[PDB]
């Protein structure tokens, strides 16, 4: 049975339907096919890793993030470019402690998700914590919270009863975020309601690094490797991220549905991407 341990939830072994058939999904994202996947029991963080947690890691180890080694990271234009996504600016000195670059800080965001962390940085933290990154299937089973093929962690309605359940964009992207959900940037890792397994902000807030190499179609075939504790392709060039972010909106990406997925190279980082850890029982 489901139980809690520290700030993690112990998800029992089980079977669920992964993926989606949203009619507007981008073919290259490989959200389909919908497929039945059986997982062994695992533990997963109920919260994405926070600024204060990452700061404790850096204080204990002296870890220097990829964004600090490169000297820049990606910041959203409005908080002071990639041709296909011109709202993303490469900002020298943007990093986890200064998420909008020079002049910014995290003093007023101690319990927000840490951002500007690459996949390498996430793995470094997880390893120091005695943990690991979730597989994409573990992430999605946990984020679905026991519901079968719902659009979002809590069901099919984005705002049940008109109440916000996650931190995404409202308004007109990218020129005006109305902040109707309470936040025009990240929110605390423990904001909004939990899902059915106790996880917070699986949808929205920040994209979350997973263990798997990205593919659009490795998982399309039916086989034990793709359906029983699937770990993704053996190689790749980008790692999977899940969940969507405070910037996501139906008018451009529509990537805050639980089946959604994207990827980034493992040394890359951005103001809307963090991670949560997992562990084996
Ligand atoms: Ca928001
Ligand atoms: Ca998320």
UniProtKB/Swiss-Prot annotation:
Record keywords, A-Z: Calcium, Copper, Metal-binding, Oxidoreductase
Role description: Oxidase that catalyzes the conversion of cysteine to 3-oxoalanine on target proteins. 3-oxoalanine modification, which is also named formylglycine (fGly), occurs in the maturation of arylsulfatases and some alkaline phosphatases that use the hydrated form of 3-oxoalanine as a catalytic nucleophile.
Cofactor: Cu(+)
PANTHER family: FORMYLGLYCINE-GENERATING ENZYME (PTHR23150:SF19), SULFATASE MODIFYING FACTOR 1, 2 (PTHR23150)
This protein's name: Formylglycine-generating enzyme
GO MF annotations, alphabetized: cuprous ion binding; formylglycine-generating oxidase activity
Pathway: Protein modification; sulfatase oxidation
Annotated catalysed reactions: L-cysteinyl-[sulfatase] + 2 a thiol + O2 = an organic disulfide + 3-oxo-L-alanyl-[sulfatase] + hydrogen sulfide + H2O + H(+)
Annotated binding of Cu(+), by residue: 248, 253
Protein residues bound to Ca(2+) 1: 167-168, 181, 183
Co-factor binding comment: The catalytic copper is required to activate oxygen and catalyze oxidative C-H activation.
Residues annotated for Ca(2+) 2 binding in this entry: 201-202, 204, 206
Entry similarity comment: Belongs to the sulfatase-modifying factor family.
GO biological process: post-translational protein modification; protein oxidation
EC identifiers of the protein: 1.8.3.7
Transmembrane segments: none
Cited Pfam families: FGE-sulfatase
């Amino acid at each position: 049975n489901l139980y809690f341990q520290g700030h993690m939830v112990a998800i029992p072994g089980g079977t669920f339907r992964m993926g989606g058939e949203d009619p507007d999904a981008f073919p290259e994202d490989g959200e389909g096919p919908v497929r039945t996947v059986r997982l062994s029991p695992f533990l997963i963080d109920r919260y994405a890793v926070s600024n204060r947690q990452f700061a404790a890691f850096v204080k204990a180890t002296g870890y220097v993030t990829d964004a600090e080694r490169y000297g820049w990271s990606f910041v959203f234009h409005a908080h002071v470019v990639v041709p296909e996504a011109p709202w993303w600016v490469a900002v020298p000195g943007a990093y986890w402690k200064a998420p909008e670059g020079p002049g910014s800080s995290i003093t007023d965001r101690p319990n927000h998700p840490v951002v500007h962390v690459s996949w390498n940085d996430a793995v470094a933290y997880a390893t120091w914590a005695g943990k690991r990154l979730p597989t994409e299937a573990e992430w999605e089973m946990a984020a679905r919270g026991g519901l079968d093929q719902a659009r979002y962690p809590w069901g099919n309605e984005l705002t049940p009863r008109g109440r916000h359940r996650c931190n995404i964009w409202q308004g007109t992207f990218p020129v005006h975020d109305t902040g109707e959900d309470g936040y025009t940037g990240t929110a605390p890792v423990n904001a909004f309601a939990p899902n059915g397994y106790g996880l917070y902000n699986v949808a929205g807030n920040v994209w979350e690094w997973c263990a798997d190499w990205w593919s659009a179609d490795w998982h399309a075939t039916e086989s034990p490797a793709t359906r029983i504790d699937p770990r993704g392709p053996e190689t790749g060039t980008a790692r999977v991220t899940k969940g969507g972010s405070f910037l996501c909106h139906e008018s451009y990406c529509n990537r805050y549905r639980v089946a959604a997925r994207t990827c980034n190279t493992p040394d890359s980082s951005a103001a809307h991407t963090g991670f949560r850890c997992a562990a084996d029982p």
